[PDB]
């Protein structure tokens, strides 16, 4: 508990990385036509969050 913070037609995209104790989240939300694979085309993700976590990460799991 050494840190705490607060703030298929749609595709939600994210990027997560941990560098020098900072955890960076980027994202994009976009409409799509075909859901079976990621849509061929281009649109860059933009930063949301940049947490000073200081924690080691080697595994992750999604929450449904």
């Amino acid at each position: 508990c050494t840190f705490e913070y607060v703030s298929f037609k749609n595709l939600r995209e994210f990027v997560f990385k941990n560098i020098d104790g900072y955890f960076k989240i980027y994202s994009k939300h976009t409409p799509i036509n075909l859901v079976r694979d990621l849509p061929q085309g281009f649109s860059a993700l933009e930063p949301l969050v940049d947490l000073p976590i200081g924690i080691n990460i080697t595994r992750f799991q999604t929450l449904l």
Binding site: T2, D20, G21, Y22, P52, G54, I55, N56
Partner: peptide, 22 residues
């Protein structure tokens, strides 16, 4: 003093292994 002790950039690790300072 038993209140103070020691064992990547800005990493922290509270896992355990520790020596208190005298």
């Amino acid at each position: 003093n038993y209140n103070y002790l020691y064992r990547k950039p800005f990493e922290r690790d509270i896992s355990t292994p520790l020596q208190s300072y005298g």
